[PDB]
Amino acid sequence: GSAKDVKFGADARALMLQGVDLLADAVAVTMGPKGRTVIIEQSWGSPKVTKDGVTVAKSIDLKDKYKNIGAKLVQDVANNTNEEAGDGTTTATVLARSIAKEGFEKISKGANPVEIRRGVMLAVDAVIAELKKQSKPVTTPEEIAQVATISANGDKEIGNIISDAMKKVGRKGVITVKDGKTLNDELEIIEGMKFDRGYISPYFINTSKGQKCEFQDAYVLLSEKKISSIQSIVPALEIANAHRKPLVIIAEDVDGEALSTLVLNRLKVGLQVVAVKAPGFGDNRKNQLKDMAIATGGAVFGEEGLTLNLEDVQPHDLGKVGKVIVTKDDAMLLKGKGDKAQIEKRIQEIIEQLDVTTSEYEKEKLNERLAKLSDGVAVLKVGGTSDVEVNEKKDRVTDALNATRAAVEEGIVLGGGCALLRCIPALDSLTPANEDQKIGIEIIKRTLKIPAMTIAKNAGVEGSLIVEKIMQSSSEVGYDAMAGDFVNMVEKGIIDPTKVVRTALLDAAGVASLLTTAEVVVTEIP
């Protein structure tokens, strides 16, 4: 293969550690309320600004291939943490560096770094256990706003808006985040099944106020194929006019003579019909029409396999909806009736798809908001006066959102970094099998102090003193680095989801303890 070059022992360890230390030093300035931002040059556009640890970590590759090995491993931990939890990234990085340094330093001739790894892993299990003991599940929706506002770097309006959306959509409902054009944040809430397609003809309009077509207690007709012929359209209208209900028709397109029947029967003898194009993306629209079919109760016409033809309809083949609103741009359907078991089956299906298949073709999420919209969904239109600002704020909002979900689903524990600090006594009551494992437990025991010392150090104060003042102090009290003084932690609102504290530490130790086992590294020649 390709010509290569290899390096041996503490020399190579010192190089890899140089890389780790560089990347860690770059990410770690972002940590905490007094933390600071990192600008990253973009190849094509104006540069990114961020406070996100993982996005800083991913941005840094290095010319020196060994230092690049270290860097790649630490960004691996930060990425794993971001994927598994969505916050706590800088924390995972500084933890990983601490384990890597303290690991590397203790290696000698007689030492057995694999066994030391076993010891640190023992220490991590023992720590997360005590963390779970410390966890107190969220209750009041004030705590939601607290976790959100702290995860959003002290922006109270963010955690307020998140609390509102989570109240009005539910704690495990769908919230999504997107760019505003407005200079301020907006919470929009959609209920129903909205999609971005409008009436084919203006003539369908009934209200003249807003220029909408508004219907209630309506029927739905779903066609996967185009409907140009009269032959397949007419029975669907006779059946609709029969039971005196309005009919909405969703199709790949509605045109030829069919549209002529629709807008003649519409303008004359005042029939209540609308026709709108299918949401429309090739094979995607098929899945969407299947979604709306299942939600509104009823079936899709045209070619799947079993073909149901448009000429032979029955009232049980249509759809039934509480309300419908359509405009030139978009269509919303509301309170559609169908089997709730079967629709939750559908949502369970799409989620179980998406989770094993995370492409950057995220229309699978666009499905999930739609079929879940009969509880509701919240859109978070983030503001700001410039794109880079909105990207920063949106990074923070997504962080706070993921943090709140982790909080509701697992629990909350003390903020600052105190939650890890309180786990040290649990390590003190361990029973190491040998010197190596004891070294591992010592490594983790030192490493737990780090996040608080870093958050304090960013504040401009004597962080490692502050850590010790915290340790002499009671369990409920910690250091408010923004206010610059000690406080009850949970009372003052400084709290972290347990899931994030668990995952950051677990990933960081998981990769770094493996890194410390290295004795020889092999790299490509420039």
| Interface residue with ligand ADP, options 7, 18, 26, 33 (CB under 6 A) | 33
282 is in an annotated binding site: no
Q: Which is nearer to Mg ion, 189 or 518 (CB)?
A: 518
HSE (side-chain half, CA atoms, 13 Å) at 446:
14
Task: Compute the distance between CA of residue 69 and CA of residue 53 in angstroms, rounded to an integer.
Answer: 18
CA angle, 237 then 241 then 243, to 5°: 120
Contacts of residue 2, defined as CB under 8 A and 6 or more positions apart, other chains included, come to 524, 525
Task: Return the structure tokens found at 72.
Answer: 């790649």
Q: Would you say 85 or 509 has its CB closer to Mg ion?
A: 85
Of the ranges 104-112, 215-223, 238-246, 370-378, which one interacts with a copy of itself (CB under 8 A)?
104-112
Tokens found for residue 105: 């330093």
Tokens representing 304 are: 């799947």
DSSP 170: -
Task: Write phi, then psi, for 59 (nearest 5 degrees).
Answer: -75, -15
Q: Does 436 bind ligand ADP (CB under 6 A)?
A: no
Main-chain dihedrals φ then ψ at residue 292, nearest 5 degrees? -65, -35
Contact between 423 and ligand ADP per CB under 6 A: no
State the Cα–Cα distance between residues 92 and 89, nearest whole angstrom: 5
How many residues bind ligand ADP (CB under 6 A)? The answer is 25
CA dist 390 and 180 (Å) reads 8
Assess 207 for contact with a copy of itself (CB under 8 A).
no
DSSP code for 310: T
User: Nearest to residue 78, comparing CAs of 63, 56, 62, 98?
Assistant: 56
Which residue's entry shows tokens 């920063």?
392
The distance from CA 43 to its chain's CA centroid, rounded to whole angstroms, is 26
Q: Does 155 bind Mg ion (CB under 5 A)?
A: no
**Residue 150 contact, options a copy of itself, Mg ion, ligand ADP, none, Cβ 5-8 Å cut-off depending on partner type:** ligand ADP
Q: Which of 159, 279, 417, 440 binds ligand ADP (CB under 6 A)?
A: 417
**Measured from the CB of residue 496, what is the shortest distance to Mg ion in angstroms?**
9
Handedness of CA 298, 304, 305, 309 (dihedral sign): positive
Measured from the CB atom, is 166 or 499 closer to a copy of itself? 499
Q: Does 463 bind ligand ADP (CB under 6 A)?
A: no
The least distance separating Mg ion from the CB of residue 399, rounded to whole angstroms, comes to: 4
Nearer to ligand ADP, 441 or 508 (CB): 508
The sign of the torsion formed by the CA atoms of 503, 504, 505, 506 equals: positive
Does position 399 interact with Mg ion (CB under 5 A)? The reply is yes
What is the Cα–Cα distance from 405 to 474, expressed in whole angstroms? 29
Q: Which is nearer to Mg ion, 326 or 407 (CB)?
A: 407
How far is the C-alpha of 458 from the C-alpha of 452, rounded, in Å? Answer: 10
Strands (E) across 200-356 are located at 213-223, 247-251, 273-277, 300-301, 320-326, 331-336
Size of the site for a copy of itself (CB under 8 A): 109
Which positions from 388 to 427 touch a copy of itself by CB under 8 A, shown as an x/- string?
A: xx--x-----------------------------------
Pattern 476-515, ligand ADP, x by CB under 6 A: ---xxxx-----------x-x-------------------
Q: Which residue among 59, 75, 90, 498 contacts ligand ADP (CB under 6 A)?
A: 90
Residue 155 touches ligand ADP, criterion: CB under 6 A: no
Q: Which of residues 66-95 bind Mg ion (CB under 5 A)?
A: 87
Min dist. Cβ of residue 437 to Mg ion (A): 22
What span, in angstroms and rounded, lies between the C-alpha atoms of 414 and 411?
11
Rounded CA-CA distance 331/320 in Å is 16
Residue with tokens 């079919």: 293
Residue among 12, 15, 32, 398 that touches ligand ADP (CB under 6 A): 32
Q: Which is nearer to a copy of itself, 108 or 429 (CB)?
A: 108
Binding flag, residue 411, ligand ADP (CB under 6 A): no
Residue 113 binds what, of ligand ADP, a copy of itself, Mg ion, none (CB under 5 to 8 Å, by partner type)?
A: a copy of itself
Where in 469-498 is the site for a copy of itself (CB under 8 A)? 482
Minimal distance in Å, beta carbon 420 to ligand ADP? 9
Give the C-alpha separation, 310 to 308, whole Å: 7
Nearer Cβ to a copy of itself (197/245): 197
Which string of x and - marks every residue 257-286 that binds a copy of itself (by CB under 8 A)? --xx--xx--x-------------------
51 known member of a binding site: yes
Would the annotation count 87 as a binding residue? yes
Q: Select from 276, 280, 281 the least CA-distant residue to 200.
A: 276
Of the candidate spans 26-34, 39-47, 197-205, 278-286, the one that interacts with ligand ADP by CB under 6 A turns out to be 26-34
C-beta of 296 vs 404, nearer to Mg ion: 404
Residue 507 contacts Mg ion per CB under 5 A: no
**Whether the Cβ atoms of residue 237 and residue 265 lie closer than 8 Å to each other:** yes
Nearest by Cα to 71 from 10, 18, 30: 18
Shortest reach from residue 96's CB to ligand ADP, in Å: 12
List the end-to-end C-alpha distance of the chain, in Å, as a whole number. 14
Interaction site with ligand ADP (CB under 6 A): 30-33, 35, 53, 87-91, 150-151, 153, 415-417, 451, 455, 479-482, 494, 496
Interaction site with Mg ion (CB under 5 A): 87, 151, 399
Residues annotated within a binding site for ATP: 51, 87-91, 416, 496
